[PDB]
């Protein structure tokens, strides 16, 4: 009963059982500061049964440093009361309540308990009770640039899914007498030692098809061993194996026990000696707070730091920790005790929300048990940080000032950023910028661009868009929401509706890009990432890339003249299957879905487009005869969809749908089996339809069958939409009209100077003249998700399932078909929050203008297994040109608008290089092997004139530069690699 229209992306990640379990769990949240509100927001978007808040402390102004649901008019009101009203709107299925007083027994109603901003004594008191009653307890703390997470899910937690991956499966080639299972040719099983698998469709060893899991002993990338199958048979052939995921028992320890001998999770292996330091430091912080009536150390105060370090020493001695305390790091923790950053709050909130979901659904591997994190490299070094500059100024940015100072606050307030994309990551980034005070100064500005519009399935993971906002532009809604969050941004945000691409260079031109300070991407496709990266490289602007996929995420930073660009490295490409496999011999559901997508494209959008283009182009046939590989197909398409098969009513449309059903699911199979009978053998004597090739079977139409009827209805509706008729969904008309159809007989055919050309010409001239029809157009069917409810997903699903039944493949329902055909990217709110936090942590480094490459950190993480990694960016490669060191990425030649001959002589004279190839855009301006006459014609022309002549298109008025790629070789004949040229028009 889950709302597939709202949880569409989260269902691809968790599932149906997981969400059913999730909607029955209660979560209590103690503390409603920035971290608490972030956790509550992520939980509410996740979809737990209910959330209860407890925080009776009156609101103070500094709390606005990271709490984005509080305003300056709420000072003096309890935080829970003023936060619940805003929290209730995020999701309508998740009631949010408030409790004004807590008692121990009252904790028994909640499945999970989250604790923030609480002293150690209260945590011990609560945990001593929640542990013995088997209630998950998560405690989170955020002190400046440091964060801590502690998880305790009981003594006997049961984890059903450990790594979160889909079960592995594959096709076998031979099973020997001793359990030596071999995969097919050049196929990798991918299993691991200690896994369990079950077999099906095994021939020769029927016993293995029962389904009892067996231990796997991997002996190679292609083969493995399962044990002894001597009794079960002698040898087996073909079949399919599938992995089985088994529950695991994880045993935790209570907080009181854990304090003595903690078990750490290392977010970064580059610093493995720190977590033991933070473990002492946070306990010392709690003790000091207990020693000063809950007053934390003042920012950058040295006496308090000394007292805190004495507490640290006392605690370390008390617990017999044989660790030498690093004085600098611990005193750093002391200085930033009162810090409250929104980036750390977002990061820890995402992590802790994921932990809450793990506790409620019993999936993925939880943290076991302590997770200490720090981003101390983000501390500015180019500004003055001292007690004088870090004291609170009585403003809403006190939390950030307590860590960075007033001067760095002024530096931030005068930024001019550019955010590309306003999806989920974009919304989180905008919220972080609004909280940090970006571009609130007299010279600040923010520019947001996004061409899409709000839908119903985006509300779940995008918390700035409400159901009342459906249909508006993403950028406008985001800008208004953030202005509401921070009133000082009124008028400092500009929103466009332009796709960032080659066709929008007139708006995001030199004038736009010269004033920026950095560019941040929130895209979902690689092409746009590469284009924006090229623009940033050309204009030399810092860039922040970030991406998510389910529970995995990554963030990268590109700094001019320091690191390589985004496009300097490769990524795995999308898998493309051989055309022979797709067209004739599929053995997977993806093959049939791809085939159905191709059929849809070639049956409802290709013919219509061809017809429409023929009626407009007067010379289409002239070029088509000599250009297209098969003009006969184009002519037949035009004829059939213009004159021969023009429909007028819906009954003939249904007849056409039945005809196409027979064509594509009954006749092609008969022809194929006529060419390759089921008993045919290969050239080696082996059976043909064995292994990767599955023997097909023709499908006989049956109206009563659900699948066939669904296909008929979908095809008829799509055809009517093509021809603009009044479609119907009443089964009575379908039943009435389908019963009067007698299929024309079909019998397989065995096959067996310029006559063909004359025949094609006769067919061509038989078509009506272009003047016969003027202004007549037909609508091709485009692809979407229920926005154009022409049964697109339904038609693809029906076609794929019918072809699967043709080849006895397991069909997939509409959900999986929507996932595969639509190329939907699984999305989670927690991953978005975490990546936004990491990017905002890198932003402060970028603002300070750090120059060393060891101070930046590209981040990668997977929350399903609690894995975090950070790596230094790759330095841009250097090269030697004319005996000088040249950067291969961020260096260019600046030249005037000179003649081609002048440019060649300039390169011959200054760099001592002979120009061989010179191209701009997609045109080859000059090449050494061109005929002398052409060059002599093209030498005395200026570069702009030459490009205009070659491209047959005047340069636009707004164009202010040209990018030229030049390949030249040294005098000795050795090819030399040189940077591109930037001609200034």
């Amino acid at each position: 009963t889950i709302d597939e229209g709202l949880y569409s992306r989260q269902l691809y990640v968790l599932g149906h059982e997981a969400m059913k379990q999730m909607s029955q769990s209660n979560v209590l949240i103690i503390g409603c500061k920035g971290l608490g509100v972030e956790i509550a927001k992520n939980v509410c978007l996740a979809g737990v049964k209910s959330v209860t808040l407890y925080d009776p402390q009156p609101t103070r102004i500094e709390d606005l440093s990271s709490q984005y649901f509080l305003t300056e008019d709420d000072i003096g009101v309890p935080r829970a009361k003023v936060t619940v009203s805003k929290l209730a709107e995020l999701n309508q299925y998740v009631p949010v309540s408030v409790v004004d007083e807590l008692s121990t027994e009252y904790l028994k109603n909640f499945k999970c308990v989250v604790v923030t901003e609480t002293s150690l004594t209260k945590q011990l008191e609560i945990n001593d009770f929640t542990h013995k009653n088997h209630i998950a307890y998560i405690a989170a703390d955020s002190r400046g640039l440091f964060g801590s997470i502690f998880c305790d899910f009981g003594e006997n937690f049961i984890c059903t899914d450990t790594d979160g991956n889909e079960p592995l499966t594959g096709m076998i080639a031979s099973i020997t007498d001793d359990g030596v299972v071999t995969m097919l040719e050049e196929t990798r099983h991918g299993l691991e030692n200690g896994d369990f698998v079950k077999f099906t469709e095994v021939k020769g060893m029927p016993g293995l098809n029962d389904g009892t899991p067996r231990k796997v002993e991997v002996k190679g990338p292609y083969t493995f061993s399962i044990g002894s199958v001597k009794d079960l048979g002698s040898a087996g052939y073909n079949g399919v194996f599938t992995q089985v995921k088994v529950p695991t028992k994880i045993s935790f320890k209570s907080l009181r026990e854990s304090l003595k001998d903690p078990e750490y999770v290392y977010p970064d292996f580059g610093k493995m000696m720190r977590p033991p330091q933070y473990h002492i430091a946070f306990q010392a912080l709690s003790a000091f707070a207990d020693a000063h009536e809950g007053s934390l150390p003042r920012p950058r105060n040295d006496i308090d730091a000394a007292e805190f370090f004495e507490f640290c020493k006392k605690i370390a001695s008390t617990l017999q920790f044989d660790v030498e305390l690093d004085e600098k790091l611990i005193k750093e923790i002391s200085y930033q005790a009162r810090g409250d950053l929104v980036a750390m709050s977002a990061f820890l909130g995402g992590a802790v929300a994921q932990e809450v979901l793990k506790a409620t659904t019993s999936k993925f591997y939880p943290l076991k048990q302590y997770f200490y994190f720090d981003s101390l490299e983000s501390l500015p070094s180019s500004v003055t940080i001292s007690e004088e500059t870090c004291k609170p100024r009585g403003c809403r940015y006190d939390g950030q000032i307590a860590v960075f100072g007033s001067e760095f606050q002024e530096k931030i307030a005068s930024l001019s950023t550019f955010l590309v994309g306003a999806g989920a990551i974009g919304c989180e980034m905008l919220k972080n910028w609004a909280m940090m005070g970006v571009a609130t100064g007299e010279s600040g500005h923010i520019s947001v661009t996004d061409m899409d519009s709000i839908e119903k399935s985006n509300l779940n993971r995008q918390f700035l868009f409400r159901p009342r906002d459906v249909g508006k532009l993403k950028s406008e809604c985001a800008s208004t929401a953030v202005s509401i969050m921070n009133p000082s941004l009124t008028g400092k945000i500009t929103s466009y509706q332009e796709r960032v691409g080659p066709e929008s260079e007139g708006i995001f031109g030199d004038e736009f890009f010269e004033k920026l300070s950095l560019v941040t991407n929130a895209l979902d496709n690689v092409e746009a990432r590469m284009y924006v990266d090229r623009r940033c490289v050309f204009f030399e602007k810092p860039l922040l890339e970030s991406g998510t996929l389910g529970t995995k995420g990554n963030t990268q930073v590109v700094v001019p003249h320091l690191t390589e660009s985004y496009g300097s490295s490769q990524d795995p490409p999308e898998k493309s299957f051989p055309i022979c496999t797709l067209k004739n011999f599929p053995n997977r559901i993806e093959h049939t879905i791809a085939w159905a997508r191709d059929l849809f494209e070639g049956l409802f959008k290709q013919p219509i487009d061809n017809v429409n283009m023929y009626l407009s182009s007067p010379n289409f046939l002239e070029t088509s005869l000599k250009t297209s590989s098969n003009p006969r197909e184009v002519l037949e398409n035009i004829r059939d969809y213009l004159v021969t098969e023009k429909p007028l009513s819906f009954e003939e449309c249904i007849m056409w749908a039945r005809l196409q059903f027979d064509k594509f699911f009954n006749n092609n199979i008969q022809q194929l089996l006529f060419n390759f009978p089921k008993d045919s053998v290969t050239s080696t004597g082996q059976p043909f339809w064995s292994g990767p090739k599955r023997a097909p079977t023709p499908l006989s139409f049956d109206i009563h069958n659900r699948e066939h009827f669904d296909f008929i209805v979908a095809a008829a509706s799509l055809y009517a939409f093509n021809y603009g008729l009044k479609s119907e969904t009443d089964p009575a008309i379908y039943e009435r009209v389908l019963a009067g159809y007698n299929p024309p007989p079909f019998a397989p055919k065995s096959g067996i100077a310029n006559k063909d050309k004359q025949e094609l010409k006769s067919i061509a001239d038989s078509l009506p003249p272009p003047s016969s029809l003027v202004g007549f157009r037909l609508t091709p069917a485009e692809f979407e998700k229920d926005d154009d409810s022409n049964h697109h997903i339904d038609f693809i699903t029906a076609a794929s399932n019918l072809r699967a039944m043709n080849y006895d493949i397991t069909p997939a329902d509409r959900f999986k078909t929507k996932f595969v055909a639509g190329k939907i990217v699984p999305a989670m709110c927690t991953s978005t929050a975490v990546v936004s936090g990491l990017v905002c942590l890198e932003l402060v480094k970028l603002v300070d203008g750090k120059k060393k490459i060891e101070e930046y950190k590209n981040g990668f993480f997977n929350l399903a297994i609690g894995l975090f990694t950070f790596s230094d960016p790759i330095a841009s490669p250097k090269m030697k040109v004319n005996g000088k060191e040249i950067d291969k990425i961020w260096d260019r030649y600046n030249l005037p608008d000179c003649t081609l001959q002048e440019l060649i002589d300039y390169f011959q004279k200054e760099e001592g290089l002979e120009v061989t190839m010179l191209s701009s855009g997609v045109s080859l301006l000059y090449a050494n092997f061109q005929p002398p006459k052409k060059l002599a014609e093209r030498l005395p022309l200026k570069i702009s004139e030459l490009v205009e002549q070659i491209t047959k298109k005047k340069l636009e008025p707004f164009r202010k530069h040209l990018v030229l790629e030049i390949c030249c070789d040294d005098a000795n004949g050795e090819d030399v690699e040189v940077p591109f040229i930037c001609i200034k028009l």
């Binding site: 299957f577 051989p578 004739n584 590989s629 197909e633 290969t682 096959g751 092997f929 070659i950 390949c967």
Partner: protein, 147 residues
């Protein structure tokens, strides 16, 4: 991609392929018209076959689109000119030059693979009646691949 394309073109220029000659069209680098001569010991002897090569924007990170232009009677080539090659769909790596593709296509012309065909009718003809296939191939190549 322009630099890579020009490097491949120059490499072809320095060492003639003898049996092949590929070059751009007009002054466009993202569209090539290659030519192939049929093997001597094959039914396609004395024929000249034209091929169209479209380099994607992401070359060499995406395989080139190679389509036959003439009409050829072969089990692994259909009427649209599509070619059944593993190195064009999923085995493509950023280390293969167009020369390798042309050599692969010439080898394909040398010996068809009817075990995994693309045109079942011609594959069945090849497996059943070899002489008729030979005659059809000779007639097709002398009617479409000469001139």
């Amino acid at each position: 991609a322009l630099k890579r394309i020009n490097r491949e073109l120059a490499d072809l220029g320095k060492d003639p392929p003898s049996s092949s000659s590929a070059g751009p069209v007009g002054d466009d680098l993202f569209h090539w018209q290659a030519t192939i001569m049929g093997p001597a010991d094959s039914p396609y002897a004395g024929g000249v076959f034209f091929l169209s090569i479209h380099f994607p924007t992401d070359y060499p990170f995406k395989p080139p689109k190679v389509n036959f232009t003439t009409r050829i009677y072969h089990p692994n080539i259909n009427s649209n000119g599509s070619i059944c090659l593993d190195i064009l769909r999923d085995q493509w790596s950023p280390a293969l030059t167009i020369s390798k593709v042309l050599l692969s296509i010439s080898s394909l012309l040398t010996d068809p693979n009817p075990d995994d065909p693309l045109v079942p009718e011609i594959a069945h003809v090849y497996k059943t009646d070899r002489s008729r296939y030979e005659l059809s191939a000779r007639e097709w190549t002398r009617k479409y691949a000469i001139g």
